[PDB]
Design an enzyme around this catalytic site. Structure first.
Site, PDB file in Angstrom:
ATOM      1  CG  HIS A 166       0.916  -3.831   5.471  1.00 18.11           C
ATOM      2  ND1 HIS A 166       0.553  -3.205   6.645  1.00 18.11           N
ATOM      3  CD2 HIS A 166       0.810  -2.895   4.506  1.00 18.11           C
ATOM      4  CE1 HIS A 166       0.234  -1.949   6.393  1.00 18.11           C
ATOM      5  NE2 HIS A 166       0.378  -1.731   5.095  1.00 18.11           N
ATOM      6  CG  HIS A 195      -8.116   3.099   0.947  1.00 21.77           C
ATOM      7  ND1 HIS A 195      -7.726   2.215   1.925  1.00 21.77           N
ATOM      8  CD2 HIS A 195      -9.306   3.606   1.335  1.00 21.77           C
ATOM      9  CE1 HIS A 195      -8.642   2.197   2.872  1.00 21.77           C
ATOM     10  NE2 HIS A 195      -9.626   3.036   2.534  1.00 21.77           N
ATOM     11  CG  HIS A 236      -1.520  -1.298   1.545  1.00 20.62           C
ATOM     12  ND1 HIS A 236      -2.487  -1.940   0.820  1.00 20.62           N
ATOM     13  CD2 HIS A 236      -1.241  -2.092   2.590  1.00 20.62           C
ATOM     14  CE1 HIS A 236      -2.772  -3.085   1.404  1.00 20.62           C
ATOM     15  NE2 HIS A 236      -2.029  -3.202   2.498  1.00 20.62           N
TER      16      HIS A 236
HETATM   17 ZN   LIG Z   1      -6.648   0.454   1.710  1.00 25.04          ZN
END
Ligand SMILES: [Zn+2]
Ligand SMILES: *[Se]c1ccccc1C(=O)Nc1cccc(-c2ccc(C(F)(F)F)cc2)c1
Ligand SMILES: *[Se]c1ccccc1C(=O)Nc1cccc(-c2ccc(C(F)(F)F)cc2)c1
Ligand SMILES: [Cl-]
Ligand SMILES: [Cl-]
Ligand SMILES: [Cl-]
Ligand SMILES: [Zn+2]
Lengths: 153, 153
Positions: free
Chosen positions: B120, B80, B46
């Site tokens: 992550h 997003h 991300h």
């Molecule tokens: Zn997101």
């Protein structure tokens, strides 16, 4: 309006956090923060061209120089955009940074966002060293710590 | 063209270099590079909001979300801007990253320059986990490594 930050890290013990704030679209930029693990005295403080840390602080390239000028002090008309001069480390090796500069910006062609802030081994001689290196790097020597300049909270 | 780079570092052994290239304004962005020290399998990948590393990867804030939407996969309309999905680490813990994305950009209000790229702890569930966390973070867990996205050579 616009607030950016920079976390200085390197191979040595030198580390710091430097904030930049600019109220007006092409007004002065307030540069402030703290650096620690420095030798007492002056240290060159420059925005370098690239936000590139692929091979440590070396990958940052030269002082941000969009107008292809020679190296100088921040108060010199003949200077790199990235020539923010020197920070002063106290006896305990802590530089409490507070600078106002009107050549750097957080918008426009002089934008330093996504570029590298570097604190150097020795004093910047502000182009008065009388050699080729003085008019390029200010003889500030090796790059102790650097960080990419990013958008802050 | 516009060419940016990101050096991923954290507290652990996870480290990588990710390049971004965009040939046309509002055109697709090629994201490619390598990450190592990862557990075999999927890892959330991300762009987070802030280029802020003041307190490690935590300071990056949430997934870059300028349009205030819910978390999704890169192929989802509801996502997003920073939702680049998963990278896949081989048995040796190396993720050879190659992504094309048209929601992120290296210009405009969707610009990711001066923001943070994060890899992550676990797989991004792409918003299909059926809990509040799934629609915020994709349940990808802790931030193994991050870097501010800077202008490259
Ligand atoms: Zn997101
Ligand atoms: Se600040 C910065 C860092 C790296 C790359 C590009 C930039 C940058 O923002 N440049 C820039 C160039 C030209 C125009 C803009 C711009 C900014 C604001 C607006 C608007 F619409 F908000 F007024 C329009 C254009 C930014
Ligand atoms: Se690339 C980048 C990094 C950091 C800050 C700003 C930028 C940037 O380039 N911004 C930018 C470039 C070109 C055009 C715009 C822009 C923004 C808003 C608008 C509108 F329509 F909302 F007013 C138009 C153009 C921004
Ligand atoms: Cl230089
Ligand atoms: Cl001098
Ligand atoms: Cl230098
Ligand atoms: Zn210079």
């Amino acid at each position: 309006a616009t607030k950016v930050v920079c976390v200085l890290k390197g191979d040595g013990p030198v580390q710091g956090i430097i904030n930049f704030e600019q109220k007006e679209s092409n007004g002065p930029v307030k540069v402030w923060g703290s650096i620690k693990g420095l030798t007492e005295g002056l240290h060159g403080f420059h925005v370098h061209e690239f936000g590139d840390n692929t091979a440590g602080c070396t990958s940052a390239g030269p002082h941000f120089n969009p107008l292809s000028r020679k190296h100088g002090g921040p108060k010199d008309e003949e200077r790199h955009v990235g020539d923010l001069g020197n920070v002063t480390a106290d006896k305990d090796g802590v530089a409490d940074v507070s600078i106002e500069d009107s050549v750097i910006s957080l918008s426009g062609d002089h934008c330093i966002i996504g570029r590298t802030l570097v604190v150097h081994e020795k004093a910047d001689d502000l182009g008065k060293g009388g050699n080729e290196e003085s008019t390029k790097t200010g003889n500030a020597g090796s790059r102790l710590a650097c960080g990419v300049i990013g958008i802050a909270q």
